[PDB]
Amino acid sequence: KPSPLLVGREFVRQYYTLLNQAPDMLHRFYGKNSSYVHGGLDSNGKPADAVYGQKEIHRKVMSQNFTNCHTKIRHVDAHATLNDGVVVQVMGLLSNNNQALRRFMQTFVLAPEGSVANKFYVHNDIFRYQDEVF
Amino acid sequence: KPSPLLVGREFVRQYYTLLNQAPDMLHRFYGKNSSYVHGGLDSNGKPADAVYGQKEIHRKVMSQNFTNCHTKIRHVDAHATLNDGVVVQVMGLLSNNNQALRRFMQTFVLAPEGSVANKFYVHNDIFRYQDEVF
Amino acid sequence: KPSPLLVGREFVRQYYTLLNQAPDMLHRFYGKNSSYVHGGLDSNGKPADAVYGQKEIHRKVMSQNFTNCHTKIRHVDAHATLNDGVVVQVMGLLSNNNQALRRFMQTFVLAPEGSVANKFYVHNDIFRYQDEVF
Amino acid sequence: MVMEKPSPLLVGREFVRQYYTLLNQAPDMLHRFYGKNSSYVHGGLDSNGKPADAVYGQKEIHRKVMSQNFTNCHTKIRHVDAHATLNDGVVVQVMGLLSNNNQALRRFMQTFVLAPEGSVANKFYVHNDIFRYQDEVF
Amino acid sequence: KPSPLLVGREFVRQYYTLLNQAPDMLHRFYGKNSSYVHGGLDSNGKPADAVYGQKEIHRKVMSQNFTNCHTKIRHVDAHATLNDGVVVQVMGLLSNNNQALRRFMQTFVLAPEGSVANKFYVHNDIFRYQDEVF
Amino acid sequence: KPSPLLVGREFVRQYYTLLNQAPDMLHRFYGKNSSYVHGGLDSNGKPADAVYGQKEIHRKVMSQNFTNCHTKIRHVDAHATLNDGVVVQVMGLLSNNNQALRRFMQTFVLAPEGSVANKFYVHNDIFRYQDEVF
Amino acid sequence: KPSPLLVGREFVRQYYTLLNQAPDMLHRFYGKNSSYVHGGLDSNGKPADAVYGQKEIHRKVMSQNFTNCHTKIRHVDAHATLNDGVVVQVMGLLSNNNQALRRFMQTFVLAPEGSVANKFYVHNDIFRYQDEVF
Amino acid sequence: KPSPLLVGREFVRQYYTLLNQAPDMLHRFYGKNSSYVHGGLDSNGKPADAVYGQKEIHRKVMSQNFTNCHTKIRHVDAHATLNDGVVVQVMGLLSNNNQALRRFMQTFVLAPEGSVANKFYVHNDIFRYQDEVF
Amino acid sequence: MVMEKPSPLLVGREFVRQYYTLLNQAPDMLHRFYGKNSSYVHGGLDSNGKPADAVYGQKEIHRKVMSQNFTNCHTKIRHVDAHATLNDGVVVQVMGLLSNNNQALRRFMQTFVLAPEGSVANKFYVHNDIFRYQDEVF
Amino acid sequence: KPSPLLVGREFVRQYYTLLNQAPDMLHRFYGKNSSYVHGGLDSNGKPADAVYGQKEIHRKVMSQNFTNCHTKIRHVDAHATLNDGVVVQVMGLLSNNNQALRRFMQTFVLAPEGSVANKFYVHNDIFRYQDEVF
Amino acid sequence: MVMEKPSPLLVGREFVRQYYTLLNQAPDMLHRFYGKNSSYVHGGLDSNGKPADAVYGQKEIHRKVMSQNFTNCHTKIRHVDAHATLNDGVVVQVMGLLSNNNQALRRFMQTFVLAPEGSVANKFYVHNDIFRYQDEVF
Amino acid sequence: KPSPLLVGREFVRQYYTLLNQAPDMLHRFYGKNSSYVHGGLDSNGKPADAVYGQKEIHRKVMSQNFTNCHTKIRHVDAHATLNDGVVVQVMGLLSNNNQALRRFMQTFVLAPEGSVANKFYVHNDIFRYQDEVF
Amino acid sequence: KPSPLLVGREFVRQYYTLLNQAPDMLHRFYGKNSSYVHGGLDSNGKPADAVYGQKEIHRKVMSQNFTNCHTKIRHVDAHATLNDGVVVQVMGLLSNNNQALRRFMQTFVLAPEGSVANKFYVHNDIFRYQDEVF
Amino acid sequence: PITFGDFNDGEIESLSSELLTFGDFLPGEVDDLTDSDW
Amino acid sequence: PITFGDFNDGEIESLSSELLTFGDFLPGEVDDLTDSD
Amino acid sequence: PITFGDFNDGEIESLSSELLTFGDFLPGEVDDLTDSD
Amino acid sequence: PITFGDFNDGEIESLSSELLTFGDFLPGEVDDLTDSD
Amino acid sequence: PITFGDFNDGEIESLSSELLTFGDFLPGEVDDLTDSDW
Amino acid sequence: PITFGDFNDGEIESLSSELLTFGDFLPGEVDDLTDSD
């Protein structure tokens, strides 16, 4: 059984590498019933709701139009959870389209796939920009 | 079965009210082999390690010396997760001993007790300030 | 037509239940061109002009930072008023962020919305404490 | 020299001033502030330990303001907040202290709902009057 | 023949008195080919265009929702113009719905109606809030 | 007939370019019986007497002693008026002798010359600073 | 006799405390043929005139409709003047009815009563806001 | 030499008399390197940090506008302390600007000045309210 | 890795935590916090109606705290504010609620004056302890 | 299909005509996700922050306040970029607000609109005052 | 260790550095920067008093580079500004000074358009190169 | 008394030597009544506010942050003036922070300091970048 | 022997002038076995490893490729040290490629050359940005 | 007789010439009782 | 069916669950612990 | 002679006068109306 | 028909109106006076 | 063999492991000519 | 003896040293490389 801390660190490295190297394959990280929210607003001004399902996750990611996003990961904290899952808490800065970096707080929940050993998928993805709620 | 969002909101209300009123009773939220990460810097200016078990969580909470610790819950996200758990991300301001309000993020993973329905315990608690990361 | 007393009691119970539970959706009680004045918040803290509209009311309520806002309603007086509306004067104790009981007086003017029968919205919402004015 | 009609706050402040000055001077004339279907309650207690109910008519109101000696009453208004409401009317929230026949200064909470008379412009009457002492509630 | 300064001062006082008292009768000031713009923004950050004709002027005035507007006329400058017309330059403060006063710049162009002596109508009305363009 | 907006924007460009370059030639814009009100304070302080005719307008313009008058045209409105004339309201910033930019309003009424088509002269010019009114 | 500064400070304390508590008793500070101006705006917009005598001063003070008049005395200057009187200049902030604090200046001329020793009456009271002139 | 109880009572009397009478002269009670921490009041509002030195103490006292501060001393406890100094714990009711009686607790640490016998100065001055804490 | 000496605020917070935990658990051992010339009052009330007086030594403090019979005390510290004072000492201002013998929560007002022991560095003892319930003062 | 040189000359003529005549209409040249960079002062005058989108481009052009922006185009070089777009490098002299000629170099990347044939939009707009970097 | 493929500004800066270092050291090797259908002008001037035309193609782009006698070229870049463009391209704007064969510092204006190679990721080729001396234009 | 031309040439050499080498000691050239105007920067650099006194002049020089200022003095004209002072008008090229040669014109008024013979101080220092006004 | 402050000031001027003008010639300042630490985050935020020798220093400088670096030297301290060398601490602003100015500190240790008098070489150069460590 | 629009002479002034009154009191009646007291 | 704003009947009541307990606390234990004192 | 700071003995007592009256108010009358009610 | 942005053919040229004159200036007099020097 | 999603072992690394190069030069080839000079 | 401000005779000249060289540059190489180029 791998260390949850190293599992979370490796997952964060791979996820934020793929977020800019090829954002259109970010949906491959998620499973059949996975929650995803990436810190957006709307007309009412309230934070955007999450989406569920790989397809809706892919649609939302494509709508988010990530172009060469640079992320500075300032803190990663990974710990054990239900069904040998891993909960990851990420503090960092993300800048999209080479604009100003924005502080962000993120929570990942990765569950084992079940068949392939040492394999995980993103069950939950919660991303929020600090400047949108504070 | 109650809404994940309802469960998260009610838990956040109860937790951050009990933290202000009776910090010594905060250990009853957690169960066996539950993770508690709330802390600041280590002896070498590093984020602290996790604390496991109800007795040790109580010992750590008492160390944090929470004096009239209020709260300013700017945002709460609650999503259903594996094993019927609820993953809550709480972002806001916390002031302890009436000092300046410091921005904070906190990830809760609430597992469902198998005995009683509509019963949860904090399987994971990961608190982290901002001034200490950026 | 429902008795003015009955609609006042209904509204007071529902309004403070929502205030204690989910302050982030208090704006749904109000409609367009509805006025909401709540205490004071300024550089000096005493003058806070009233806000109008659901979106501005939601902004103001988000500023009020209601967290576990407990309320002990000592008295409610509901009377019939123009356009078959009701006027409610409620007196009680309020505690936000787990402070002590502060005596408060609120005046609501509720108006029917026309289409749906026995449906009201908060046209006017005036809040005051006894610490601000002797 | 614009002839701007008064703001709701100015209307409420002026009405509170006139109402309480009249109450101090001529309580019997106070009934002229109310209309046919006006509601009025002024800090009463029934033989139950509960707050009293309200009368719904200038006549019942006159009987109420008459029953209430209201003779030589000193009032100190600490807060007035007025806003616009349904049908051009004005809702006023009054916080103050009152004393009738020179007892102690009792804190009171009041809500006024004034409505335009209609036939005459810039004229209002007290449609609703809710008055409660803090002693009989808290 | 009356003094253009007197005509401008009387028109300004009458126009703002009528705007405060009965804004739904403001269209009676204007004529067949009158132009009316009252300083709005529309979906691009660019000032709103003017409207022409008495009916369109009335519709725009009603849409503008003038509720107990208070004005402080700080400067009026009236001068003669073609066909004995009057051009009026107005500097002032206007507050709608008893909110904060906003600095405004206005230009009126009044023309003789032709048959009745000393009778004028608003051929042109240009109104702009300073905070919307500066 | 050229568009009133085009006429106004072209006249504003020409006028505020000639004001900076050759203010001695500004009098050629006006004709006989033309009002010029550009001014500041006097013994009374608030009103400035208008000067009529090309000679008086040139004398007054030379009196203002324009020196590298820089202009920042924030907004310009041009509408048709009597006798196919154009009424222009110009709002912006003016800086004389490289001093601090001051907010200004200027109302132009351009009357068409009856001899040559596409020809206008400034029948009315009403300039007014803001800092001197508020 | 006491120090002019002592007299001025004591009078300022008593006056601005009685103004908050019992404004109806403020007329007892003045005697006959005593000047009292407290204004800034009227029907014509000119500074308010003066009311002389205890009766007229009381009538004016009552019109001002003082309601919980809070004060913040930034500075008080007290100097001896002719006939052993005291001239006080008071600069500070004044809020009526818990509204926004407005800067104010007030000149008091206190004349000694001939009969009683250590007794003064407000011979002159001149109040002026700042926002109403600048 | 003088009873610590006598010193504490004499201080309390003089200090609160001067607070009620001449707040601008409170800084004379303290010396250099002395500390003056009052109740929470600042731009943020809660974290009112301590200030040191006579001049900074005077600035803080002026900021905290003291106008007719009425104080009812319910209890005073004076005890001997290091360097033959005294410690005074005072409980009472304070009303500033004519608000209501607010429960307050103050802690003075007074040290002998050394040069003049029976002369003390406020080395430490900690003020606290009941409402802003309980 | 710096060996910084604790700030007065940290010293006061840590002392309050230790003091009240010991009072809850082992009140007999509470006397070890005080020195020879230590003054101590804890919410006293003589048979007159006035606050009690102070003991001025370790053994009298010991006897007194046994006299108060602290058994299973629950304390909720709402405010602690510590500052430096003469001779590197720390003055602590404490606001809280206390209950002895499972009684109601009583608001208490407390001032501590801790002084360095002198021999061992970073060691303090309670020179002054002033404690009063607000029920007996207000 | 059209010669890249012909497209470049056409665009340079139209763009620098519209810059001089109607600066507020420049945003129509660009489309979504297009980049405009033109000097500008974040605080020192050197920080050049790119803006994207028609609305942000409009705001940046308005902040520059182009007034009578004259330009003499010394050289234009047009070539064919990817996806059948064009690249234009223009060298010339620019004078805004009637100041002296300043050497400037601009680089446009124009992409075909796609639907309408022979239609282009400014995908990239990099402007540089040569004197700023030399 | 997020890989984080370089931003357009970094790509442009690195390309300018490499391009001008190669031009200084091995101008004959500079032709490898361009593709099959690359456009290239470098401060040309025909015998008409007008700027020279363009060259489209790698082989004769090399011939044009050879024709210009690039020997010991000293270049000082004073401004580089790069941005993203069509087909994940990079448009670079360069302000600088150049001297070939040790004449004076001639001030020059340049525009680069780089496009992905496609076969290999993170690989670019100079699709467009426009270079003009200011004296030959102004 | 020496030749005013010699005094001007000596002062110009010393001043533009000390400006190049040690800008932080430029304030020693001025007295207490000296005036120093140089450039200007409020929002875009247009308002040139003169500063008076050695300390304010040093603040201004330090704000400008002269770093390796190279000066080519094309011309110097020195003349005698009131109270046996000197007036120097210098024309040249200035480059600060290694920018290009910018044409500049400076006017110094030097006054004898009285006590020490043949000693002067810069009473007036008016600097102007020619390009910024032309 | 020159003053250490004089040596430090002259070296700072020459070094930063050469850095702006000809950064490729910066290697001539250093000798053999000289330390160069200028840099930022190498791979994981670690401090940049020092490069020793003229060849490595030149390679590292060319790697940083300062295209046009403008420096605002806020302060320079120069003190004597071992072997008559000079230690300089330079604090200021640095902006590469006309980007935003960033605060920086730089420690130079200049060692004298035993061959030629009044000759120094940069034995140590330690550059550090502020935003990268704070 | 200066008028604007189709408004008659003094129409706007009459439409706007009405003081603030409460109840059935004529304007200035309420204060009269207060003025009766010293 | 007296409802307010845009809330459907019973929406506010559905917004809360009295059967929801966390940890070892019995239902309402936290409310009793905090509201009382 | 217990004094505090740079206060001479009796300075604070001399800082105010208890027989200073304004208008027709008797001594202490203003305090009486404005102390508590 | 080469067009740019959303402008139609001739839309930008329609904003010039070079035959417009103001005052007694002949066409081109203002720009001739200003741009030359 | 720690993998996430359906990505194979090292697929993300392989995809994202490519240095920035220009023209046909191998990475680090261009600076070699500069290193040839002193 | 003509001086300005508060500087002595030749104080400014003493503030500048022409013999101060850094690295391999001859006394004036940096200035020659910077100006007139």
Side-chain angles (χ1 to χ4, degrees), chain R residues 5-29:
Chain R
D6 48 15
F7 296 102
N8 318 307
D9 167 26
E11 145 161 344
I12 272 169
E13 187 58 45
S14 70
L15 165 159
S16 90
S17 95
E18 242 299 326
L19 311 143
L20 173 55
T21 55
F22 305 101
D24 83 10
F25 304 92
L26 299 324
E29 181 185 344

Short mmCIF file of all heavy atoms in Angstrom, two decimals, chain R residues 5-29:
data_model
loop_
_atom_site.label_atom_id
_atom_site.label_comp_id
_atom_site.label_asym_id
_atom_site.label_seq_id
_atom_site.Cartn_x
_atom_site.Cartn_y
_atom_site.Cartn_z
N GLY R 5 -6.68 7.81 -13.16
CA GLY R 5 -7.58 7.70 -14.30
C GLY R 5 -7.26 6.47 -15.13
O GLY R 5 -6.80 5.44 -14.62
N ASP R 6 -7.46 6.60 -16.44
CA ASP R 6 -7.15 5.48 -17.36
C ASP R 6 -5.75 5.68 -17.95
O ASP R 6 -5.33 4.84 -18.77
CB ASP R 6 -8.22 5.35 -18.45
CG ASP R 6 -8.57 6.66 -19.12
OD1 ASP R 6 -7.80 7.63 -18.96
OD2 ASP R 6 -9.62 6.71 -19.80
N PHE R 7 -5.06 6.75 -17.55
CA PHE R 7 -3.70 6.98 -18.05
C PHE R 7 -2.81 5.80 -17.69
O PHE R 7 -2.85 5.29 -16.57
CB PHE R 7 -3.13 8.26 -17.46
CG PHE R 7 -3.86 9.51 -17.88
CD1 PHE R 7 -4.76 10.11 -17.02
CD2 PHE R 7 -3.65 10.07 -19.12
CE1 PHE R 7 -5.43 11.26 -17.40
CE2 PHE R 7 -4.32 11.21 -19.51
CZ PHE R 7 -5.21 11.80 -18.65
N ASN R 8 -2.01 5.35 -18.66
CA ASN R 8 -1.08 4.27 -18.42
C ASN R 8 0.11 4.77 -17.60
O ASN R 8 0.23 5.95 -17.27
CB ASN R 8 -0.62 3.66 -19.74
CG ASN R 8 -1.76 3.49 -20.72
OD1 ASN R 8 -2.79 2.89 -20.41
ND2 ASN R 8 -1.59 4.03 -21.93
N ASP R 9 1.00 3.84 -17.25
CA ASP R 9 2.16 4.19 -16.43
C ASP R 9 3.10 5.09 -17.22
O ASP R 9 3.64 4.70 -18.26
CB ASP R 9 2.88 2.91 -15.99
CG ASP R 9 4.25 3.18 -15.40
OD1 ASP R 9 4.49 4.29 -14.87
OD2 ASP R 9 5.10 2.26 -15.42
N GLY R 10 3.29 6.31 -16.72
CA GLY R 10 4.20 7.25 -17.35
C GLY R 10 3.69 7.90 -18.62
O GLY R 10 4.48 8.55 -19.31
N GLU R 11 2.41 7.73 -18.95
CA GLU R 11 1.88 8.34 -20.16
C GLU R 11 1.92 9.86 -20.09
O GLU R 11 2.32 10.53 -21.05
CB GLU R 11 0.46 7.84 -20.41
CG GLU R 11 -0.48 8.87 -21.04
CD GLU R 11 -1.69 8.23 -21.69
OE1 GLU R 11 -1.66 7.01 -21.93
OE2 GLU R 11 -2.67 8.95 -21.95
N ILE R 12 1.51 10.43 -18.95
CA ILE R 12 1.52 11.88 -18.80
C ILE R 12 2.94 12.41 -18.85
O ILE R 12 3.21 13.43 -19.49
CB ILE R 12 0.80 12.27 -17.49
CG1 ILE R 12 -0.70 12.44 -17.74
CG2 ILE R 12 1.37 13.56 -16.92
CD1 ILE R 12 -1.52 12.56 -16.48
N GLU R 13 3.85 11.72 -18.15
CA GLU R 13 5.27 12.16 -18.16
C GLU R 13 5.76 12.14 -19.61
O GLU R 13 6.28 13.17 -20.05
CB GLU R 13 6.12 11.25 -17.27
CG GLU R 13 7.54 11.75 -17.11
CD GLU R 13 7.66 13.14 -16.52
OE1 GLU R 13 6.95 13.44 -15.54
OE2 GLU R 13 8.46 13.94 -17.06
N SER R 14 5.57 11.02 -20.31
CA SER R 14 6.05 10.91 -21.71
C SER R 14 5.47 12.05 -22.55
O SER R 14 6.25 12.69 -23.29
CB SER R 14 5.73 9.57 -22.31
OG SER R 14 4.33 9.43 -22.53
N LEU R 15 4.17 12.31 -22.43
CA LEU R 15 3.55 13.36 -23.24
C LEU R 15 4.14 14.73 -22.92
O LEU R 15 4.37 15.53 -23.83
CB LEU R 15 2.03 13.34 -23.04
CG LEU R 15 1.13 14.49 -23.49
CD1 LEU R 15 -0.28 13.96 -23.64
CD2 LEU R 15 1.11 15.64 -22.49
N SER R 16 4.37 15.01 -21.65
CA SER R 16 4.78 16.34 -21.21
C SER R 16 6.29 16.49 -21.08
O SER R 16 6.76 17.55 -20.65
CB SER R 16 4.11 16.67 -19.88
OG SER R 16 4.91 16.25 -18.79
N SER R 17 7.07 15.47 -21.43
CA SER R 17 8.53 15.52 -21.32
C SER R 17 9.10 15.84 -22.70
O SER R 17 9.48 14.95 -23.46
CB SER R 17 9.08 14.21 -20.77
OG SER R 17 9.48 13.35 -21.82
N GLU R 18 9.14 17.14 -23.03
CA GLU R 18 9.71 17.59 -24.33
C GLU R 18 10.22 19.02 -24.15
O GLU R 18 9.39 19.91 -23.87
CB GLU R 18 8.65 17.54 -25.43
CG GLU R 18 9.00 16.58 -26.56
CD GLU R 18 10.27 16.92 -27.31
OE1 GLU R 18 10.58 18.12 -27.47
OE2 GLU R 18 10.95 15.97 -27.76
N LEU R 19 11.53 19.23 -24.30
CA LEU R 19 12.11 20.55 -24.09
C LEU R 19 11.78 21.48 -25.25
O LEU R 19 11.46 21.04 -26.36
CB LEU R 19 13.62 20.45 -23.90
CG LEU R 19 14.11 19.40 -22.90
CD1 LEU R 19 15.39 18.76 -23.39
CD2 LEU R 19 14.30 20.03 -21.53
N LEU R 20 11.87 22.78 -24.99
CA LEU R 20 11.59 23.79 -26.00
C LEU R 20 12.75 23.87 -26.97
O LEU R 20 13.89 24.15 -26.57
CB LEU R 20 11.34 25.14 -25.33
CG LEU R 20 11.19 26.34 -26.26
CD1 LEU R 20 10.09 26.09 -27.28
CD2 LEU R 20 10.90 27.60 -25.46
N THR R 21 12.47 23.64 -28.25
CA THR R 21 13.48 23.69 -29.30
C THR R 21 12.94 24.47 -30.48
O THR R 21 11.73 24.59 -30.68
CB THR R 21 13.90 22.29 -29.76
OG1 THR R 21 12.74 21.54 -30.16
CG2 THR R 21 14.61 21.54 -28.64
N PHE R 22 13.86 25.02 -31.28
CA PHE R 22 13.51 25.81 -32.44
C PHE R 22 14.24 25.28 -33.66
O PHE R 22 15.36 24.76 -33.56
CB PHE R 22 13.85 27.29 -32.23
CG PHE R 22 13.23 27.87 -30.99
CD1 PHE R 22 13.98 28.04 -29.84
CD2 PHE R 22 11.90 28.24 -30.98
CE1 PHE R 22 13.41 28.57 -28.70
CE2 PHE R 22 11.33 28.78 -29.84
CZ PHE R 22 12.08 28.94 -28.70
N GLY R 23 13.59 25.40 -34.82
CA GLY R 23 14.17 24.87 -36.04
C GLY R 23 14.31 23.36 -35.97
O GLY R 23 13.46 22.66 -35.40
N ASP R 24 15.39 22.85 -36.54
CA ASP R 24 15.69 21.43 -36.51
C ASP R 24 16.79 21.07 -35.51
O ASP R 24 17.27 19.94 -35.51
CB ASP R 24 16.00 20.92 -37.93
CG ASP R 24 17.46 21.16 -38.38
OD1 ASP R 24 18.34 21.55 -37.59
OD2 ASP R 24 17.71 21.00 -39.59
N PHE R 25 17.19 22.02 -34.67
CA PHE R 25 18.27 21.77 -33.71
C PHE R 25 17.82 20.82 -32.61
O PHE R 25 16.70 20.92 -32.10
CB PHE R 25 18.74 23.09 -33.10
CG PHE R 25 19.18 24.11 -34.10
CD1 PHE R 25 18.29 25.04 -34.60
CD2 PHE R 25 20.49 24.14 -34.55
CE1 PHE R 25 18.69 25.98 -35.53
CE2 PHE R 25 20.90 25.07 -35.47
CZ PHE R 25 20.00 25.99 -35.97
N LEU R 26 18.70 19.90 -32.25
CA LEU R 26 18.51 19.11 -31.05
C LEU R 26 18.61 20.01 -29.82
O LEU R 26 19.28 21.05 -29.86
CB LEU R 26 19.54 17.98 -30.98
CG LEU R 26 19.55 16.93 -32.10
CD1 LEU R 26 18.14 16.63 -32.59
CD2 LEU R 26 20.46 17.34 -33.25
N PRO R 27 17.95 19.65 -28.71
CA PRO R 27 18.01 20.53 -27.54
C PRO R 27 19.42 20.64 -26.99
O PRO R 27 20.13 19.64 -26.83
CB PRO R 27 17.06 19.85 -26.53
CG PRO R 27 16.79 18.49 -27.05
CD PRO R 27 17.39 18.33 -28.41
N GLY R 28 19.83 21.88 -26.72
CA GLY R 28 21.19 22.16 -26.30
C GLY R 28 22.21 22.22 -27.42
O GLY R 28 23.41 22.34 -27.13
N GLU R 29 21.79 22.12 -28.68
CA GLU R 29 22.75 22.21 -29.78
C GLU R 29 23.16 23.65 -30.05
O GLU R 29 24.33 23.92 -30.35
CB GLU R 29 22.15 21.58 -31.04
CG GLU R 29 23.09 21.59 -32.24
CD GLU R 29 22.43 21.07 -33.49
OE1 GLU R 29 21.37 20.41 -33.38
OE2 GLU R 29 22.97 21.30 -34.60
#
